[PDB]
Amino acid sequence: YCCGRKLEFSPQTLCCYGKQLCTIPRDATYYSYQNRYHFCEKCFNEIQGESVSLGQTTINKEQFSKRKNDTLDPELFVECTECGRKMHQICVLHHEIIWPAGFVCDGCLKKSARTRKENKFSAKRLPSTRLGTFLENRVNDFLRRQNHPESGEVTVRVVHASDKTVEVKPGMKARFVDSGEMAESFPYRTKALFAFEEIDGVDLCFFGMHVQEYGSDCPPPNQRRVYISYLDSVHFFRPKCLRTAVYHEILIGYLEYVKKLGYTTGHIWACPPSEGDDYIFHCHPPDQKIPKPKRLQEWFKKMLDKAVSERIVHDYKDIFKQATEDRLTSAKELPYFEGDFWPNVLEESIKESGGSGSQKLYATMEKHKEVFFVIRLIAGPAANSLPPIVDPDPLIPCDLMDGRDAFLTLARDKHLEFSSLRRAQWSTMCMLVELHTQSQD
Template sequence: MIESHSQSLTNGDMKAATTGQIDTSSKQLLKHLPSRFNLSSGKYTLCVKCFNSIESESIFVGDDPTQALVEIPKKLFLLAKNDIQEPEIMIDCIICTRRWHQICALRLDQIWPEGFICNTCIREYNIKRKENRYIAQQLTVTDLSSRLEERVNKFLFDKDCHEGRVTIRVLASCDKICKVKSQLKIFYRNQVVDGYPYRKKAIFAFQEIEGVDIVFFGIYVQEYDERCPAPNTHRVYISYLDTVHFFRPKLYRQDVYHEILIGYLDYAKQHGYMYAHLWACPTREDFDYIFHCHPPEQRLPKLKHLRDWCRKMLDRAIAEHIAIDYKNIMQDCLDNQVYTVLDIPYFDDDLWPIIIEDSIEKLNQEDPTEISGKRKSANTYEKKLLKKMANQMSNCTDLLSIIFSTMEKRKEFDIRYYCTVCDDFDLCKKCYNVEPKYEHKMECSVLLTVDMSQDNEQNLLNSNDKSIASTLL
């Protein structure tokens, strides 16, 4: 990501630094540059990841693609942090001279270069404003976007809701490679592919509210088709999901979110995907996933509410014969008899590749006697698993044991007892079992996962229609 504004760090705090920048308006830096031609901007900013990915000692930048790029040594870039709050840009009406916030007036010079006229003057003097051609409906239509849009608007029509038509578009679609991390490649030398190819898509939903397109929903998905090696074959991964609560009417807001997700699962099913993976993790108050910021009054879902929300969506998908079942990742591994880490799906920006890397490092640091002691304390499944894997390398068995142990811990962590009377009162399993019991009735909630195979499909549906499975990690 390119940040156009950032602040230089003077205390050398590497942890806080998120961007690197070079200010080409500085006399000290300019005298080192071979030429200023094609450098009209004052700053060129890169994120740390992109900056470090450039192996050469120089970076080529420029503002005009028709001109030669300018070579800038990497040592001239300064560490910076993108934490400046930009002042609100103000604009004046060319008729009444009233001053407006540019963002409040929804003013963009590229659309209306002839000057700003406020809505008050437009009404009072009956002025016709130039039509804005840059609206959501004018964006490129794809098969996926048309299916989702048709499904959502049909739902709203059936509910007799006419607040504003919803427009859904795939704003980005590109081929990517999920690169396997270094520790796993070393651990399973010559047994692991370098990466898993997939198609990355960014899908957003807009609603026309008072004549303006408002984006209210977005998801990033990763699609691993039949050309991708196992275990990622025929899988989709919904890596990010984010919303802002502007959809109207509020009554159908959550239903519309569900319609989009179920519609995407249906689309994936129709294109041969057999499994879907979805994070069910509450949003942190200090973290923005897709949208740059959220309304301060927007409530963040608690763990229990998010689980119930996902369950409700998946139950609807099952009722429509789109999904077959859902379960947690531990149960999914048990049902599919996973005997090696290489059988666990491996996605970009997912939790489990990180846990696998950490587990390998932990395993490499452990003493063999400690590993032997852990084997003795393994549960029944792990003992059976280790016995079946006797012909494999011992370190592979130890690694899988660590991974399953982590999954089991997360499974225990995900068990919650919530009060049926009080709002947002939850207890962990340990606290729930402490006497005396809580005065109100408590119900158990366990994080769920989804899985499906063709054998299960024939048994459960007794039909030839393919269905999609969604796995909540």
């Protein structure tokens, strides 16, 4: 073995198909059918009756297998076509698409005064966008101002852009849409972008983001607004003392960019993911922790405070303070975003109140105010006569990056973990190959 190390992949986590938001971690005992339908021990024995409705097909309980989530797949080896040396594929970062001729180890290459032919599936060679260019220029300019000897070049790429609509859910639809008081759906553009850092001639994907952008063609209350769907990171940015600043630089640059195009407001739901290691990146490092709510909120406040002092953000408020200043009276006046908290809670509010869309609206907003940031980018009379929003970047069809589920599934299916620096670099290389090959079609 190249290193002296016996290496295997970790058991990926599963789901109690009974209770939503239940998960089955490493070493837990569970019940599975056809390697598809998984139940944890508690959620399985808590089923009354040996009939288990699947799909919908009813399936007997003895047709399930009792097992524990402790399977460890060994890492794969590659063989040098010249010496026969066996090395972990991840250790030497050999990808058969990038180097189809075969794996030649570094030792045989140095003996023959040879080097690997260029990796043309790099982050740098992903197609550029005006947004990506703006973001990476900001980050790299910040990084060279810091003069830290360890920092590498950062490239930012938009890897998906497509048109979508968010549909008002049945409760709010019956209250406000069927009476003609509110649009049935809101058109928006979703964008997925990632940041990579060159670490010793090797790309590392360390940051990912998906956003929802509602243009000047959107009906109120959503028009000229951007909303962050989700954020994620792999904490191996070099150097560590600049990691937080770089995240902040990307986010501030994004607000600066959409402000320039004419978007008036930004929206952030400070919402930690559920415990586990899969959000956008599969299998986070074991010592990278999900922040607790208060610390995440302070993190966003720090970022926005820097944006205010840079004269990019005019000001920001919690949703409760914001609605008070806007003199809001009805739930139909709240921006309605895909997958956001407020569409969900408004469904429950209308149900519990027997059909009201304003009853406890202010109480619910105050109860949760610290979690919802409303960021004003264009204020005062400047926001009044704005020209239409024209995005200079084209659409980018890429099914793998339409939402976060597809890339997570591809990572799970192909053992692309981001749990260590070496595995994250390998997963980055594979992810780039996928993005380069799906595009050339």
